[PDB]
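Input for the complex:
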Amino acid sequence: AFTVTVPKDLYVVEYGSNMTIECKFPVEKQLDLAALIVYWEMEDKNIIQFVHGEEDLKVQHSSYRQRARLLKDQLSLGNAALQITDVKLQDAGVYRCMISYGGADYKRITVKVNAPYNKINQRILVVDPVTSEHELTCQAEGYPKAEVIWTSSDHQVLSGKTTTTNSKREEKLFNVTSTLRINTTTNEIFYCTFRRLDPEENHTAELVIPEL
Amino acid sequence: HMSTLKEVQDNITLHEQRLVTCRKPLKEIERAVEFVPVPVLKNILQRERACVSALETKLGELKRELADLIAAQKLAG
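Predicted:
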């Protein structure tokens, strides 16, 4: 008869990314759009209500207007693909999909959102061109809190200061900023590592001293 | 006088034509699907009840007008 298949019960998603969680169901040659109902939901928030070949917007929860969308073209392949744009921490939880086509069935999907320190912004300035002292800076946004380990091109630890605040563009993301002020010359390579826990993630940017 | 009654009477029929169109979305699902998911059912009846109570309020204020106009043409004649 009718069964709903989940290719993967768990989706691990990175922050600020797209996501396409998929629910499958049997289809025969063509589709009967009239007899199909697709419904997505998470924590009893209505996300998708697809009836009679068109999504029912009036029911869709407000916090998903313009970020949730079902892909019609996939339905002809027996795939109810829910797509969310710019994934946030608030999108983590348990998602339910309920499909009605002839018979019916529902399935659950879990979503966990990484908040990694992928994007690292670096700035190199010249404190005193006489002593050739520079000011190296690294900053990134992630969760949970992280520390910065300044290592040379010779894999040796240098000391810096780490200021750790909360994000403004987003809610609880920690903004970690570290600064190096070391006398150095042109073409010298340095590294700033972003070590955070839960789980152990190391992310390192490379800063090369320019000339003049 | 008689055209004023005629303008309200075919405005109450329109609204009774609007009341029937409010349970319409559900009947067009029972026509097409054979198993209605509970959350999709649970929400539709709430919209179908949000309208019907609202449309039944309107009929009270229209069926009251005709009685007023009927009373007016009893004081006159």
